[PDB]
Amino acid sequence: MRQCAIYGKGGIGKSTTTQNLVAALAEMGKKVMIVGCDPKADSTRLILHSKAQNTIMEMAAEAGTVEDLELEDVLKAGYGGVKCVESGGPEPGVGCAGRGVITAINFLEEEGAYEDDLDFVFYDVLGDVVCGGFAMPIRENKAQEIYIVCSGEMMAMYAANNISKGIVKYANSGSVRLGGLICNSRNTDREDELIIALANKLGTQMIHFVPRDNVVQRAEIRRMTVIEYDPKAKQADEYRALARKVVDNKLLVIPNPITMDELEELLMEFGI
Amino acid sequence: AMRQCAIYGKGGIGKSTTTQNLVAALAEMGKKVMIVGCDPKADSTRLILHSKAQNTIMEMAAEAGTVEDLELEDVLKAGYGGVKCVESGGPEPGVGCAGRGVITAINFLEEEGAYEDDLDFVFYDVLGDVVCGGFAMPIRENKAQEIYIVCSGEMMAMYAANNISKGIVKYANSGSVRLGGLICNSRNTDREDELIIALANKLGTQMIHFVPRDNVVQRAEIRRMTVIEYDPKAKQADEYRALARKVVDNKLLVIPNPITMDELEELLMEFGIMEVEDES
Amino acid sequence: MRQCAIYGKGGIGKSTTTQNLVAALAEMGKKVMIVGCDPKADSTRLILHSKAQNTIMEMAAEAGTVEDLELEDVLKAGYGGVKCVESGGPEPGVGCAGRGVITAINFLEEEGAYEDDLDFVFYDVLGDVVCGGFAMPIRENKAQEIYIVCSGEMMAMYAANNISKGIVKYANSGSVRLGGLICNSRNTDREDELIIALANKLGTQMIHFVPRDNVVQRAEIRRMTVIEYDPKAKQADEYRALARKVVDNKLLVIPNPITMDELEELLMEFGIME
Amino acid sequence: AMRQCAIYGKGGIGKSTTTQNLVAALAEMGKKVMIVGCDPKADSTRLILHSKAQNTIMEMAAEAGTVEDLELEDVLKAGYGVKCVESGGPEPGVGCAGRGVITAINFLEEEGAYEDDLDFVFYDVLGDVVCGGFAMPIRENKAQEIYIVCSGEMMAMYAANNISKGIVKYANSGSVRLGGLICNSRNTDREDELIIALANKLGTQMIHFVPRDNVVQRAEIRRMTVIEYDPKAKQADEYRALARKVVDNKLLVIPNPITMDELEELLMEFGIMEVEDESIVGK
Amino acid sequence: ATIYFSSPLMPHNKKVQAVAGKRSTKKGVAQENGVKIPFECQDGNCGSCLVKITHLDGERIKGMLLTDKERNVLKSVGKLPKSEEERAAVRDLPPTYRLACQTIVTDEDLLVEFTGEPGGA
Amino acid sequence: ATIYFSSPLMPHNKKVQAVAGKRSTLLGVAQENGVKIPFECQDGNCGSCLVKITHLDGERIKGMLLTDKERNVLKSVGKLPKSEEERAAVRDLPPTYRLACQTIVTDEDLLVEFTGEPGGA
Amino acid sequence: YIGTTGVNAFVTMNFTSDFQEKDIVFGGDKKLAKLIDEVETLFPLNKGISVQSECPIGLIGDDIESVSKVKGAELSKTIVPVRCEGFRGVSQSLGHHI
Amino acid sequence: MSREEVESLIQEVLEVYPEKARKDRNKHLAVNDPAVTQSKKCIISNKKSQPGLMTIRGCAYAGSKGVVWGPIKDMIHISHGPVGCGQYSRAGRRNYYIGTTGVNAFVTMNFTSDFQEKDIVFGGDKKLAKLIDEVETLFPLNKGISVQSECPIGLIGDDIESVSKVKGAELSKTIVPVRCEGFRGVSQSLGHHIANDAVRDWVLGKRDEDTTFASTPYDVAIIGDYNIGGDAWSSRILLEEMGLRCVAQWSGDGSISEIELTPKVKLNLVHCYRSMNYISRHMEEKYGIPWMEYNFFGPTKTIESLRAIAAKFDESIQKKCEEVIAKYKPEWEAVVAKYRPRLEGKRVMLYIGGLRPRHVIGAYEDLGMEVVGTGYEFAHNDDYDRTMKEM
Ligand SMILES: Nc1ncnc2c1ncn2[C@@H]1O[C@H](COP(=O)(O)OP(=O)(O)O)[C@@H](O)[C@H]1O
Ligand SMILES: Nc1ncnc2c1ncn2[C@@H]1O[C@H](COP(=O)(O)OP(=O)(O)O)[C@@H](O)[C@H]1O
Ligand SMILES: Nc1ncnc2c1ncn2[C@@H]1O[C@H](COP(=O)(O)OP(=O)(O)O)[C@@H](O)[C@H]1O
Ligand SMILES: Nc1ncnc2c1ncn2[C@@H]1O[C@H](COP(=O)(O)OP(=O)(O)O)[C@@H](O)[C@H]1O
Ligand code: ICS
Ligand code: CLF
Ligand code: SF4
Ligand code: SF4
Ligand code: FES
Ligand code: FES
Ligand SMILES: [Mg+2]
Ligand SMILES: [Mg+2]
Ligand SMILES: [Mg+2]
Ligand SMILES: [Mg+2]
């Protein structure tokens, strides 16, 4: 069993990239588990074909406490035999927004949903802020591999740098490593090698470059994921190649943070 | 008279630039205002002092023994005709709460008494991605009298504005915190002015002037300078000026009406941003 | 302006190897400084020609306090390039035995002994246990490079493992890294490849293999370094090569700790332990 | 009815093997003995429990949260008829390495392992450096009789001198005394008489001299004491003699520490180091 | 009952005298003396009021009841280890971390530490 | 003066009453109540009696004199930031870390924490 | 037990404050002090007093500890206040601990 | 001028001392540079005196009993310990006051326990209680008792706080124990600190739950003026002529009631920063009372301080301040015209305790004199920060 997490700022195609990754992995006979560590209840809509999967926090609130919660109502199986967990946050302004992640991980460990011959577990974690229950997988050594989804925008690169700093802080206390930098395109000039340069600057390797196209939206309307919407699509094969590079990845390194002026100069000398 | 404003919104849509240009216009109009940058990346004061990312309160506090040893002048700097700037900063990633710097900086400024009598406007530039934590500290502790949410035509900004309004309505009873309006920063997408107008009407609040996109903002940014004083004769300078007069003359402070995610989806659908969803 | 620490179990020839390295670096146009953090003030005997260099804390107690103490009094240049300071230690049972190291380092930073002319700073530090003042160079990022002197004896590799764990614990604090392992050899079979394998399993590299010699006893009765005594002796050129490898080192790694059973099975396969 | 004893010395000379063999010999005489390993290496109960390593008190306290919840049964392990406990130590680089000792003995005293249901209590303490934790059994009057293991090595007798300095420092507030010196062979020709002279200078005696026997490795390969492995070997006889003279030891004196020059001249006297001269310093 | 409030936000630790057993909780005591503990709920389900309680008089420790809601909230923010949960269940002894809105003042001397952030970092 | 001794070695923190300003120091108070703070010298230079002192009543903080011997020992231990030295030198306010053998009890409520190790880890 | 009931032994007796609505609204502590004075007046051979609190005592908000201390110092006799309210604890088990 | 000459003079003077004394005393002598903002890099202060060098500093008992607590007139101050300490400080300081001594005022009278050998061996707590009783019977009109402890009190381990609490509860009186032993601290500064702490802990927080006193928006309290020869009265007439109302006086001609009424004051006017900055900071932190430092030495400093104080109120106070300045201008103009030509160009050297070396510089410069050398016995580094610019 391999524990991987997907981080990065919100709005960069994180959820759909993770969904295509796991569906592609399930196409090969592997069995995967999804834990949505994003307060938005959208991390598992494209593999279950639902309006919004009911979150663990909502069920715990409606069923009194989390001790009355049953595994069958929170663990839903979708296409390819994937196991789906959805960790909703509390209302804005009501305590820490990361209590849902801690509660869900503790519940999953208590009910034993990990040892059931799984091979891949994927934590779709919000990366805008690394704190509370969002830094909890790094704090508790839950996700051994971490991938950051970024683009050629200042916010995305800063989020990647912050997550790298968070990895560095807890490097000595466990085997939490940054596998690579997933790159998503917004149809801008000179973006692929910008991200390759960032990855080489902070020690990792670029995993795969995902271009922007309209097929994923047409699949999104049908509450459908791209691969099993149309397996012969070019983007479907690109997602398959991304999955192949993820599973056959053996480089695990400890990154080095880059300063604000370094990132500014890197962005400036590449034409943006 | 001691008007306190907060600027919320999703990270990366232009809260810092809009706040700095607004403050430049207000200072141009002979109003002594003060900027508090409560965003963890600490660049809310770059275009005022023109030097660099101003050293935050947390950096001196760590360098000194305590937040009391820190001097008021050390963190509260002056630029653009006496306009004052303080920067909150934040802890190291994965340590504590990212909003701790906001609480520390506000407590420090309150204790030293930087909120002088001759101040007319205090603008907090804060991060709106997560309402919780110290980012909810201005609302919960009535630090910010009125809030403006910057927004765009994207889903994420719309949802962030909804969450900020949810926080405002949750803490409305215990303080004078109220919503003033919404500012639409343009991504040059089609049918976005009426989109933000529709969301503002749904929330029950009016809509602060919409700012179109252009490349003069980057031209002023490269020189570490605001658009207003790089080219006061441009349409952008008077654009930010008009937004400023509407800010000063704003009087509609209402309790918003947060809407459901399904209402957000249908309101994106009706303007063509989100495609029509068919159950079959 | 590079800082290196020499760590290892007491009785491993740490002081002698450090002084020979210093003397080999001095001749090649380099001004370096030795600091002996071992409670014994013998880390600078082979340089200063002295019987026992007066430690910092001895004189600090004699002169009332550290504030009334002068840099010229502790910083004696036995050789023109080399500069030696002795930290000293307290009487046994009196407080932490490493607080002298903290006092010495703070004194040197206060009086600016690290200015404008130092190519190398060496800290001959006690490695039998890493804690307090002895862990201070690793903890306070005082010594960027760390070299462990070890032999084939089980306790030498155990001390090396402890030092590696200590470096790992403060890896994120600063640039403190393990730069290599040093082989001080006793007349026993299968020693070089032993700590070579230890180096590969630690993720580090073995620097040099320094065997036993009779010239070291002649040097100690001479009270001078071997290179100073007999620069034509084979161990003199060997120390020269060790210093050359130290200067031209480029790879510094975060070590990997080794469990008790794994080191035990290594010693099993080599047969040093039955 | 309880004789509290400690074994000190520089790490790597054979404190653990000598201590375990002494306890094994004592258990043959019907005595009930208990072992405390105050050394961070945590291997002083290996040859008695036949195990790979006894779990330390600090390890149990970390896995259970605190030391107050810890039981005696999982901490005290009875093998060969004698009880065994391990102090352990903290992670190298943080805290004081001797802190585990302070955590262990205290805990024991509050749980009742220190009640006089035993004839002998022994502390295998690391004596390479004398600081807090490793000098706590001397400072807190928890070890009546101290025995120093020493070889014909400069470092070993330096450690003996340091431990004697600690003992004489804490001689006026308690009954901590030096019971003798134990010599383990380093294949040195003049080491026996060397440490004889050292003990005479310090005002103490040799309890015994232990020959270097290759059968001790053959006993350790089974995780076994040499007394049980060959009851009929001469090494077992030497260990039994050491035990009987430890029991019959009545000379408990406050030591007289010597200086560095005295130690240097004692090394010179027996040929371990050559003759130093002042006219041959600069060549 | 004597309570000493401590916080990095507070320039000085504050000593207050409180009446034990009141229906109003430690949150009432904090609010009367102007101690800024974040209270962001009225049902005791958030973790905003997390504090660290130290019993200065170790001999005078009073047995209490750890409510199921408080236990679940403390576990939700990861501030309740298994050993302390078992101690509360068996010996009826309080844990180190408490919730101000759910903490009933007892007749002893207490030190209440808070950092100004909601429970769960 | 009310002193609360706390330590991981002590199962429970102890509350003791002490006479302020006594020639006998905090060490006298610790010894007469059986609190095992490691004292290892008689000239006040070892630093093994290092403790962390917290004034529970922030209002009732009494100005004191930080002698040069204490300052030098604390620097040799490392438990003395430059900011605390400046505060003690200018405002005559005690530092966070003190030496029990050289600390005079003042008329206030104090919390004294020690780890059982000599000063300097 | 062995004793003269009502003189030096009071096991089968029932001493109660008998709270009314005006006690529920306006304090109740001064009633406790007056009750202690009356108990000392009418039962001089007692060797102590305990005040076992019932449910409303904690709910309305009362400091029986200060009354116990003051009256014990004034009358030189031990007064033990016991916050044994019914709602505290799930059963009789916590009453033993209190 | 002659800065190098000054440094050479310092070096030559320091030559007689032994090595330790010379090294320590080199840090305490400096050449003034007005551009320096932090004195720590130029001069060192607030350190122990070198033994056997004839220092001029006092003890903490002098700074506490003799300086702060002494001027309070309606209280009775007991010099707890041997007889000499009270004798040498009796009426040696000219802190003027109004009252009938021995009946309702006790400034110039020496109360002492007069410790003997049996007092040292056994203790003086019972003797202290008996003394308090005798004071109560013999001086009924006293409005408070303060017990200033001397060296043997803290050296033998007496519990005067418990005695003070017991006697204050018994007699319904304010009894203030001050632990101002001479060996505590290196000079009178720690005596000032201890006296301020005692005032804060036992006196200040008394009229906190009452509101009978009628407050006025023009309420000021003089802090750190001890009426040496009547200085506080001149300052008071100058302030009242401005229209402000002075409620408290710390502590020259001061009363316990004024100290208790101080927390109901709008503005604190601190004259002596060194001795009473602690209580002013405590007041600002607790009651929210702003405090500001003023200077009434000479006409220039007086006018500047008057304008600064008036700037904190409405325009009527400013107009009254201008009226006062206009009224008092001709008097000091005539004084200057009479005396300046006789004193013009003279060089003056100063060495006083604290805040007087810098305060009187303006007065000297108003007559044409120039200060060439100044210094302090017990000022801290902030005082040197303040006095670098003025020299
Ligand atoms: N490869 C892609 N091509 C085109 N659009 C994409 C692609 N990946 C993501 N997007 C768009 O980006 C948005 C990101 O939303 P989603 O991935 O659901 O959550 P998050 O905001 O966390 O990334 C989606 O609405 C989707 O339409
Ligand atoms: N009014 C605007 N028009 C066009 N671009 C803008 C405008 N405001 C900001 N930007 C661009 O947005 C980028 C970052 O915006 P910024 O203000 O840093 O986001 P945040 O609000 O998260 O701080 C800048 O590079 C700038 O060029
Ligand atoms: N290269 C070598 N050849 C022979 N003997 C050596 C060599 N290096 C060190 N030694 C011996 O090892 C002993 C330990 O020396 P020293 O460094 O003073 O002790 P420590 O390593 O404990 O500081 C010395 O007596 C020396 O003779
Ligand atoms: N009496 C002995 N004869 C021969 N070798 C011994 C004897 N005692 C110990 N040794 C050897 O010394 C090595 C290490 O000794 P050990 O007891 O671990 O040192 P310490 O005294 O630090 O515990 C062991 O591998 C063992 O083989
Ligand atoms: S209180 Fe101080 S020694 Fe500030 S102890 Fe001393 S009546 Fe002096 S320089 Mo006498 S810090 Fe007052 C003083 Fe100045 S007694 Fe007077 S003149 S302004
Ligand atoms: S420093 Fe201060 S004034 Fe000095 S004694 Fe101490 S409290 Fe007092 Fe008074 S009595 Fe005489 S003069 Fe002293 S020797 Fe004994
Ligand atoms: S730690 Fe992060 S998620 Fe938790 S309250 Fe603070 S900002 Fe919000
Ligand atoms: S930390 Fe190390 S050197 Fe210091 S007392 Fe403890 S064992 Fe000795
Ligand atoms: S205020 Fe939410 S748990 Fe107490
Ligand atoms: S007992 Fe050694 S410094 Fe205090
Ligand atoms: Mg998503
Ligand atoms: Mg910003
Ligand atoms: Mg050596
Ligand atoms: Mg051992």
Side-chain angles (χ1 to χ4, degrees), chain E residues 27 38-42 44-49 73 99-102:
Chain E
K27 148 206 247 301
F39 300 116
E40 317 179 351
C41 88
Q42 318 267 258
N45 281 321
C46 77
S48 297
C49 62
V73 176
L99 299 163
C101 79
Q102 314 226 219

Side-chain angles (χ1 to χ4, degrees), chain F residues 67-106:
Chain F
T67 61
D68 295 341
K69 200 202 292 244
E70 193 155 317
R71 194 159 52 70
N72 286 147
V73 175
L74 290 176
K75 291 156 142 305
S76 283
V77 163
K79 287 315 177 62
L80 192 53
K82 274 318 217 93
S83 36
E84 300 201 321
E85 197 180 10
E86 214 250 8
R87 181 182 71 197
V90 186
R91 318 224 312 269
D92 280 333
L93 276 203
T96 314
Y97 287 101
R98 309 285 315 279
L99 296 166
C101 76
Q102 290 174 49
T103 282
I104 316 273
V105 164
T106 44

Side-chain angles (χ1 to χ4, degrees), chain D residues 24-25 38 63 87 96 114 122-123 141 228:
Chain D
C38 315
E63 84 160 6
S87 274
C96 165
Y114 281 157
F122 263 81
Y123 302 89
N141 197 330
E228 147 170 36

Side-chain angles (χ1 to χ4, degrees), chain A residues 9-11 39-40 45 51 91-98 126 128-132 134-135 139 154-155 158 161-163 165-166 169-170 217-218 220-223 260-261 264 268, chain B residues 10-12 40-43 46 52 92-98 127 129-133 135-136 154-156 159 163-164 166-167 170-171 222 224 261-262 265 275-279:
Chain A
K9 63 112 171 194
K40 272 179 42 208
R45 280 163 75 268
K51 253 284 217 172
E91 303 293 332
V94 201
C96 200
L126 164 141
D128 289 300
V129 304
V130 198
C131 43
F134 303 109
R139 278 201 354 260
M154 221 294 273
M155 278 339 270
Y158 181 113
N161 201 38
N162 269 25
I163 300 152
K165 302 216 213 190
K169 175 93 183 83
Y170 296 117
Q217 321 288 12
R218 307 187 340 236
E220 238 168 54
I221 308 313
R222 328 227 181 174
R223 298 140 163 209
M260 203 32 232
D261 277 44
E264 267 178 2
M268 188 60 192
Chain B
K10 162 191 161 205
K41 43 152 42 159
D43 52 340
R46 195 98 75 117
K52 202 55 83 185
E92 206 70 298
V95 162
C97 161
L127 161 73
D129 289 13
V130 286
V131 187
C132 60
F135 305 122
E154 189 106 323
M155 176 76 281
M156 281 318 279
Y159 165 110
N163 274 4
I164 297 149
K166 282 192 193 177
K170 160 207 202 315
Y171 289 123
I222 277 180
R224 325 296 176 61
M261 180 52 124
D262 54 47
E265 291 162 333
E275 300 209 309
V276 183
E277 205 289 323
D278 187 358
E279 271 236 37

Side-chain angles (χ1 to χ4, degrees), chain A residues 155, chain B residues 12 14-17 20 39 41-44 125-126:
Chain A
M155 278 339 270
Chain B
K15 301 188 297 302
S16 304
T17 281
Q20 272 156 118
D39 200 288
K41 43 152 42 159
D43 52 340
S44 147
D125 164 42
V126 318

Side-chain angles (χ1 to χ4, degrees), chain C residues 65-67 93-96 99 102-103 106 131-133 139, chain F residues 40-41 45-46 48 71-72 75-78 118-121:
Chain C
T65 201
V66 193
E67 293 268 25
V94 175
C96 182
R99 75 177 182 267
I102 317 187
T103 317
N106 290 121
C131 44
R139 181 215 296 124
Chain F
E40 297 178 348
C41 62
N45 291 283
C46 84
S48 76
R71 194 159 52 70
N72 286 147
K75 291 156 142 305
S76 283
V77 163

